[PDB]
Amino acid sequence: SPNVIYILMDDLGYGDIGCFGQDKIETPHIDRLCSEGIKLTQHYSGSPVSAPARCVLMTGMHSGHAQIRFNNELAERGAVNNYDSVYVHKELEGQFPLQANTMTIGRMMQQAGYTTGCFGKWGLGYPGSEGTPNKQGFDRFYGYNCQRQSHTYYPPFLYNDEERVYLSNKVTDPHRSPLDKGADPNDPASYAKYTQKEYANDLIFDELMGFVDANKRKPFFLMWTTPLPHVSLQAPERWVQHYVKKFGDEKPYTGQAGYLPCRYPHATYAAMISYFDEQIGQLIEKLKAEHLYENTLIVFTSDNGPTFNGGSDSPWFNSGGLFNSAYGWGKCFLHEGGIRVPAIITWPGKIKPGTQSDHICAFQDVMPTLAELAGITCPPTDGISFLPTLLGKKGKQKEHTYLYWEYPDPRIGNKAIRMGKWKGIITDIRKGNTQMQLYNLETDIREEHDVAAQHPDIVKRFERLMKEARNGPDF
């Protein structure tokens, strides 16, 4: 049973990496990883936003059964949105917690004899809660507890396990840091103040690499939950200038769609992904140098589709790849662009290199996949192992009858079914819509031609399957 490294990026689109059709952003180390293993083309998140996606991944329950189904900031605690206040009061930090003793893939691997580590972002329980990573199957955590904290890459503190470590960075509000009055938005010097001393991603990486170095002679399960490339747009000047040379001059971002101003939004978004790409390259080098490469399975994927704010330009990068990526088509929505994420798995000598599988699978499936892989009986799950697909034993690959998603956000409210080529969506539920849109993904991959009235049989079946699939209060 091998080492497992699960690399989860944050708001990385289906088409944001070279091996899924990206033409502008250079991802050589990720493309190399794809060439050395299997490419999954119909792999789905638990959810089109961060916390619930991660909840489905950690717990092997789909969004219709999961504890966390939306980003819940527990605003009743007080000034949770005030960055001065969160710095003073950790009680105000972070998100709705996982319940005590929740079986997670961390906990499951721990009981199998793995040393478990999570490096990057949590988002699944506030500090002091029973939902903290160390109380949810991780021997080791470093990085952001809080999805709001990661809105800046120069935060005043991070977490080493249960403890804050204070950095040399000053406290900032990345939503209330506009340019100085009368500062030229075309002058790069106007953006100098957004760069401080300690880039969180440098520190997260050094801690991940130290964990690998420390457990290099033991079975380890390591989750690299990088906040990249989630806004704000901040990257080392090295990588920004590389893409300023390639793309040329561009319109600056002044903060109109939230998060920090950025002189070069295109160059910086590309810089963020290629910088992380370079870190994966350094990790592969270390695994090879320590003779771990053959005995380590690596997953690379994203928690949801690409975003529409913070100076992102998903359409310009075609971050959806096959899918539309404008507001309504990506992040926050149950369109394919929102819930379908690029996936690579390598395990040198076991997974045939440069192969592809269109097998319909999702984040719930990771729990049973890892259970089969590590040779321990699978806990209760909505998932189905896709290990047979990874090892090219397609004969013994069980199939989901259908997949269900719900995103009960306060404003819009979404449900979706996929059953074969058929994709049903109900959106605007909070406005009292119950009318389903129906797309044939074989003939309409971009979901541009609603044909619900031409298949009332399929709509009725999907309405029934939506009732059967879900737990808890309806919306």
Ligand X SMILES: CC(=O)N[C@@H]1[C@@H](O)[C@@H](O)[C@@H](CO)O[C@@H]1O
Q: Which residues are annotated as a binding site for N-acetyl-D-galactosamine?
A: 352-354
Closer by beta carbon to ligand X, 151 or else 340: 151
Q: What are phi and psi of 2, to 5 degrees?
A: -90, 170
Strands (E), 145-218: 157-160, 163-166
Helix then strand then coil, in percent of the chain rounded to 5, is: 30, 15, 50
With contact defined as beta carbons under 8 Å apart, do 305 and 14 qualify?
A: yes
* Cα gap 374→353, rounded to integer Å: 22
- In whole angstroms, how far apart are CA 41 and each of 20, 115, 131, 153? 9, 31, 32, 31
Residue 207 binds which of Ca ion, ligand X, none (CB < 5-8 A, kind-dependent): none
- Rounded Cα–Cα distance for residues 214 and 207 (Å): 10
Query: HSE of 2 in the Cβ direction (CA atoms, 13 Å)?
Result: 21
Token pair for 51: 């916390």
| Residue 169 within binding range of ligand X, rule CB under 6 A | no
How many residues lie near Ca ion (CB under 5 A)?
5
Work out how close the CB of 401 gets to ligand X at its nearest, in angstroms, rounded to a whole number. Answer: 31
81 binds ligand X (CB under 6 A): no
- Is 138 buried (19+), middle (13-18) or exposed (0-12) by CB count in 10 A? buried
Instruction: Please select the residue that binds Ca ion; options are 10, 336, 365, 447, rule is CB under 5 A.
Output: 10
Q: Quote the distance between the C-alpha of residue 176 and its chain's center.
A: 25
Q: Between residues 32 and 175, which has the closer beta carbon with respect to ligand X?
A: 175
Q: CB of residue 267 vs ligand X: minimum separation in angstroms? A: 21
Check residue 16 for interaction with Ca ion (CB under 5 A).
no
User: Using CB distances below 5 to 8 A depending on partner kind, what does residue 309 bind out of Ca ion, ligand X, none?
Assistant: ligand X
Q: Closest approach of Cβ 73 to ligand X, in Å?
A: 6
Q: Shortest Cβ distance from residue 194 to ligand X (Å)?
A: 17
Q: Which is nearer to Ca ion, 303 or 447 (CB)?
A: 303
Minimal CA–CA distance to 11: which of 342, 366, 396, 293?
342
Which residue from 147, 301, 314, 381 is in contact with ligand X, where contact means CB under 6 A?
147
Q: Mark residues 88-107: x for contact with ligand X by CB under 6 A, - for none.
A: -------x------------
Position among 41, 42, 71, 81 found at the interface with ligand X (CB under 6 A): 71
Query: Which residue is nearest to Ca ion, using beta carbons?
Result: 50
Residue whose C-beta lies closest to ligand X: 147
- Which residue among 149, 232, 234, 307 contacts ligand X (CB under 6 A)? 307
Among 226, 304, 325, 437, binds Ca ion (CB under 5 A): 304
Q: Is 11 in the site for Ca ion (CB under 5 A)?
A: yes
Question: Hey, which residues between 40 and 79 contact Ca ion (CB under 5 A)?
Answer: 50
295 binds ligand X per the rule CB under 6 A: no
Q: Where are the alpha helices (DSSP H) in 182-309?
A: 200-214, 237-247, 265-289
Sheet holding 422-426, edge to edge: 403-407, 414-419, 422-426, 437-440
What is the DSSP secondary structure assignment for residue 128, as one 8-state letter?
Answer: T
Residues that bind Ca ion (CB under 5 A): 10-11, 50, 303-304
Residues that bind ligand X (CB under 6 A): 50, 71, 73, 95, 147-148, 307, 309
